[PDB]
């Protein structure tokens, strides 16, 4: 039995920026009241985890990163009602407390209990459950999935189908749901529309999936890496364009291709310049542009507000707009019912011990999602 005891297990600890993960032994405290300790089964490598390594995203170090995962409940703290030992679960990097003004709002999902805006790198109670070589180690987004065991607050965990294949459904924890929801829920892509998707990684491919599911007639993929185009077409892109092939700025190309601007555009990269390009390429009177990519820390963009005065809508979202604890089980159920596919996103499956090799595949351009198996 491990319940009520400290677990010594393996984890990938990030001690400082721009260094490899250190795979080593950590101690994982048992869960306190309203907390859940989870044996991890599979975790994806999302670009947002690479942002913590690169310093694009600031969060307290040292840290156990990782936020796109699934596993099995090992134990529950006092007062937990929503999961039990042995349940398949997904940690939620955006919590759903159910009590805050956002949780109560029909269109809100960015729960005020989140650890994104102003990251503390702790549990809800402001403490850490992790130590390594006698030092406290920070949590990441209330999840910390690069560990054989994690501890999460109840509001940051969802119970899923006992028959779920966790090596696939872990992508519902971030990249699939974010892209799909950005198209179907945040943009509300319409039947017959023309869409432009900037960035053809795991999240951008999931935006294409959503645009196709919503009945878009044209879906133009934009990436500087033409190796990304074949899989973008497989999942629904009708055309792909590489900005580097053109003398004109790509906003002009896309406005020309779409006979005066697209209905919906998506920025799924994380660059200030492409956020402005994507806004510009949507039709000036009724276009909608959605920012999905995470910008670099503390940098402002420059834009001409006449782009909005003509009638454009500009919005962004975390996690595809989905209220996390309500949505994740339904998405897993939809997957089980063959409503969408996840295999197109998975290009590599590695043991957890090869986390660094997984990140090198992402940085080199080769991979979409690497799944790590514990």
Ligand X SMILES: NC(=O)c1ccc[n+]([C@@H]2O[C@H](COP(=O)([O-])OP(=O)([O-])OC[C@H]3O[C@@H](n4cnc5c(N)[nH+]cnc54)[C@H](O)[C@@H]3O)[C@@H](O)[C@H]2O)c1
Ligand Y SMILES: OCc1c(F)c(F)c(F)c(F)c1F
Annotated binding site for an alcohol: 48, 67
Q: Which of 23, 100, 224, 257 binds ligand X (CB under 6 A)?
A: 224
Q: Which is nearer to ligand Y, 171 or 262 (CB)?
A: 171
The verdict on 312 binding its own copies (CB under 8 A) reads yes
The residue range among 39-47, 97-105, 240-248, 351-359 that interacts with its own copies, by the rule CB under 8 A, is 97-105
335 HSE (CA, 13 A, CB side)? 25
DSSP structural state of residue 189: P
Q: Which is nearer to its own copies, 219 or 282 (CB)?
A: 282
Name the residue with the smallest CB distance to ligand Y. 48
The verdict on 317 binding its own copies (CB under 8 A) reads yes
335 close to 312: Cβ distance less than 8 angstroms: no
Q: Which of 110, 176, 266, 374 binds its own copies (CB under 8 A)?
A: 110
Q: Which is nearer to ligand X, 160 or 268 (CB)?
A: 268
Q: Which of residues 340-369 bind ligand Y (CB under 6 A)?
A: none
Q: From the CB of 202, what's the least distance to Zn ion, in Å?
A: 9
The verdict on 93 binding ligand Y (CB under 6 A) reads yes
294-150-327 Cα angle (round to 5): 55
What does 199 interact with, of ligand Y, ligand X, Zn ion, none (CB < 5 to 8 A by kind)? ligand X
62 close to 99: Cβ distance less than 8 angstroms: no
84 close to 76: Cβ distance less than 8 angstroms: yes
User: 41: closest CA among 161, 158, 139, 168?
Assistant: 168
Q: From the CB of 224, what's the least distance to ligand X, in Å?
A: 5
The verdict on 116 binding ligand Y (CB under 6 A) reads yes
Number of residues this chain uses to bind ligand X (CB under 6 A): 31
List all residues 6 or more positions away from 323 whose beta carbon is below 8 Å from its beta carbon. Answer: 96, 103, 108, 109
* Active site (catalytic) residues: 46, 48, 51, 67, 174
What does 67 interact with, of ligand X, ligand Y, its own copies, none (CB < 5 to 8 A by kind)? ligand Y
**Gap between the terminal Cα atoms of the chain:** 20
The verdict on 174 binding Zn ion (CB under 5 A) reads yes
293 HSE (CA, 13 A, CB side)? 24
Q: Could you give phi then psi for residue 11, rounded to 5 degrees?
A: -145, 165
**What's the chain's length in residues?**
374
């Amino acid at each position: 039995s491990t319940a009520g005891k400290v677990i010594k297990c393996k984890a990938a600890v990030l001690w400082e920026e721009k260094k490899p993960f250190s795979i080593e032994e950590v101690e994982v405290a048992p869960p306190k009241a309203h907390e859940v300790r989870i044996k991890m089964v599979a975790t994806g490598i999302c670009r947002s985890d690479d942002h913590v390594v690169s310093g694009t995203l600031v969060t307290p170090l040292p840290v156990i990163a990782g936020h796109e995962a699934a596993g099995i409940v090992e134990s529950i703290g006092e007062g937990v009602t929503t999961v039990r030992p042995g349940d398949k679960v997904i940690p939620l990097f955006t919590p759903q407390c159910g009590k805050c003004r956002v949780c109560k709002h029909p269109e809100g999902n960015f729960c005020l209990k989140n650890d994104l805006s102003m990251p503390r790198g702790t549990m809800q109670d402001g403490t850490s459950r992790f130590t390594c070589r006698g030092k406290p180690i920070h949590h990441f987004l209330g999840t910390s999935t690069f560990s054989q065991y994690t501890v999460v607050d109840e509001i940051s965990v969802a119970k899923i189908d006992a028959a779920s294949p966790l090596e696939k459904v872990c992508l519902i924890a971030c990249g699939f749901s974010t892209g799909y929801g950005s198209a179907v829920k945040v943009a509300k892509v319409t039947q017959g529309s023309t869409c432009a998707v900037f960035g053809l990684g795991g999240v951008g491919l999931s935006v294409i999936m959503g645009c196709k599911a919503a009945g878009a007639a044209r879906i133009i993929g934009v990436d500087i890496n033409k190796d990304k185009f074949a899989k973008a077409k497989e999942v629904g892109a009708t055309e792909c364009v590489n900005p580097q092939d053109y003398k004109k700025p790509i906003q002009e190309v896309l406005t020309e291709m779409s006979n005066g601007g697209v209905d919906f555009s998506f920025e799924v990269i994380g660059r200030l310049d492409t956020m402005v390009t994507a806004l510009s390429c949507c039709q000036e009177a009724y276009g909608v542009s959605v920012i999905v990519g995470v910008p670099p820390d503390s940098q402002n963009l420059s834009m001409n507000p006449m782009l909005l005065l003509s009638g454009r809508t500009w919005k962004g979202a975390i996690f595809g707009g989905f209220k996390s604890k309500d949505s994740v089980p339904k998405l897993v159920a939809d997957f089980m019912a063959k409503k969408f596919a996840l295999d197109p996103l998975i290009t590599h499956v590695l043991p957890f011990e090869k986390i660094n090799e997984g990140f090198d595949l992402l940085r080199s351009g080769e991979s979409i999602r690497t799944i790590l198996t514990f």
